[PDB]
Amino acid sequence: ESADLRALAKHLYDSYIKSFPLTKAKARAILTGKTKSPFVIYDMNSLMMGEDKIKFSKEVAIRIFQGCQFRSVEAVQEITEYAKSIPGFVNLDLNDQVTLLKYGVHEIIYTMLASLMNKDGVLISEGQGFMTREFLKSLRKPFGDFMEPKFEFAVKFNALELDDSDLAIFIAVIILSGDRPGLLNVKPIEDIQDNLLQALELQLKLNHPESSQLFAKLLQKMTDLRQIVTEHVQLLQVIKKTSLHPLLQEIYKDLY
Ligand SMILES: C=CCc1ccc(O)c(-c2cc(CC=C)ccc2O)c1
Ligand SMILES: C=CCc1ccc(O)c(-c2cc(CC=C)ccc2O)c1
């Protein structure tokens, strides 16, 4: 029983390493200076210098919004390739595969975003850049309101000190939520998640002797993430009153 759960964990970790360009391990090493330093964007001048220097003519707030929008669409492709590696996922009905992805990707994006963040800012362009929390806040309304709730989540989430092995299972649990609207076959999804949760619980016990509360804390974080997405899509709704990506538009119309 436990041997199969450890096999699941390893399979997910190996797939995780394949699917995502920058792991938390590599991100924290860059953030602590335990490695070539990223270009720091902290004001308008450094933003322009960063755009020329970093290998990635409109209004600054819009330019940053567009780049982040396009990074989000790349993120969903990465998550989709990871999802297909989760044992049993591809055996699900295709309509349920896409439904789980649509309702789940943004929760996963903000989960993994936390790996790139500290209290001072966020790693961008696969660790080549570092954009400060206060610079993002200084952007004109309502663009300055986007990242702050993510930073707020990240500092609390990062205090849990999860590693890539923990996160691989955590994100798999989130993708396979049987309570997403419009699901055709709930039972096979619940079966997979129950096994992933067992694997998660075992992983946390072995990997984190310093805390017996982690599993419960992580369940709490899963509900918190749903609130972050809801806040994000509502802030996206008021921007309809100020070039939105069509793929994201399709995801949002289900989320509204
Ligand atoms: C790794 C994915 C990239 C990612 C992650 C979280 C995010 O909140 C955003 C994001 C940021 C802004 C703020 C810029 C003005 C606007 C829209 C967004 O979608 C992008
Ligand atoms: C001017 C910079 C706008 C810009 C352009 C391309 C990018 O990929 C990103 C980027 C954004 C986040 C989310 C944090 C805000 C994470 C990773 C990234 O790489 C940002």
Author numbering: 207 to 241, 244 to 264, 274 to 459, 464 to 477
The paper states:
PPARγ distributes in adipose tissue, regulating adipocyte differentiation, lipid storage, inflammation, hypertension, and atherosclerosis. Different from RXRα with the L-shaped ligand-binding pocket, PPARγ uses a much larger Y-shaped pocket for ligand-binding. And PPARγ ligand-binding pocket can be divided into two sub-pockets, AF-2 sub-pocket and β-sheet sub-pocket. PPARγ agonists are categorized as full and partial agonists, depending on their activities in the cell-based reporter assays. It is suggested that PPARγ partial agonists bind only β-sheet sub-pocket, while full agonists always occupy both AF-2 and β-sheet sub-pockets to activate PPARγ. However, our co-crystal structure of PPARγLBD-magnolol reveals a distinct ligand binding mode. While, in PPARγLBD-magnolol structure, the hydroxyl groups from the two bound ligands interact with Ser342 in β-sheet, Tyr473 in AF-2 motif, and Ser289 in helix 3 of PPARγ, respectively. Although magnolol is big enough to accommodate mostly the L-shaped RXRα ligand-binding pocket, two magnolol molecules have to cooperatively occupy the much larger Y-shaped PPARγ ligand-binding pocket. The value of approximately 2 indicates that magnolol binding is positively cooperative, and both the binding sites can bind magnolol simultaneously. Thus two magnolol molecules cooperatively induce PPARγ activation by interacting with both AF-2 motif and β-sheet, respectively. Considering the large differences between RXRα L-shaped pocket and PPARγ Y-shaped pocket, future dual agonist design may focus on PPARγ sub-pockets, since each PPARγ sub-pocket has a similar size to the whole pocket of RXRα.
